[PDB]
């Protein structure tokens, strides 16, 4: 199995682009990251920052997670992100996503040793 840290990297990191540049970004990335293999993953966010900047969020503002957990952290600054969500015209295996680029603070849940992001919670 994939470790929790590696799964977070695979699903959310995209340090190779500064931002989504086309409406087809989500369709291409969801496929490239294998998120449309067994089913169409309904929602997913990609972060366009270096891995080190994202891992550093685990040392930033500690805030509560929606589920009540207390290992969530919010980034002090805004980051370049792309939210990908299936449209109503999406049916596996023909997955289709709406791409929405934005600059916002991210919230992640951290764990382990080293203590790194394991779950993408939300953006503000
Ligand atoms: Cl994979
Ligand atoms: Cl997500």
UniProtKB/Swiss-Prot annotation:
It is an enzyme of class 4 (lyase). One of its GO terms (biological process) is defense response to Gram-positive bacterium. Its EC number is 4.6.1.18. The active site is at residues 12, 119. Endonuclease that catalyzes the cleavage of RNA on the 3' side of pyrimidine nucleotides. Acts on single-stranded and double-stranded RNA. This is Ribonuclease pancreatic. GO terms for molecular function: lyase activity; nucleic acid binding; ribonuclease A activity; RNA nuclease activity. Pancreas. The chain holds residues 27 to 150 of 150 of the full protein. GO terms for cellular component: extracellular region. Interacts with and forms tight 1:1 complexes with RNH1. Dimerization of two such complexes may occur. Interaction with RNH1 inhibits this protein. Monomer.
């Amino acid at each position: 199995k994939e470790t929790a840290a590696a799964k977070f990297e695979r699903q959310h990191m995209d340090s190779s682009t500064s931002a989504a540049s086309s409406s087809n970004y989500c369709n291409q990335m969801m496929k490239s990251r294998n998120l449309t293999k067994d089913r169409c993953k309904p929602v997913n966010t990609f972060v366009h920052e270096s891995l080190a900047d994202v891992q550093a969020v685990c040392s930033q503002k500690n805030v509560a997670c929606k589920n009540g957990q207390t290992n969530c952290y919010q980034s002090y600054s805004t980051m370049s992100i792309t939210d990908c969500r299936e449209t109503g015209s999406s049916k596996y295996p023909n997955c289709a996503y709406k791409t929405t680029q934005a600059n916002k603070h991210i919230i992640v849940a951290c764990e382990g040793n080293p203590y790194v992001p394991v779950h993408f919670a939300a953006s503000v």
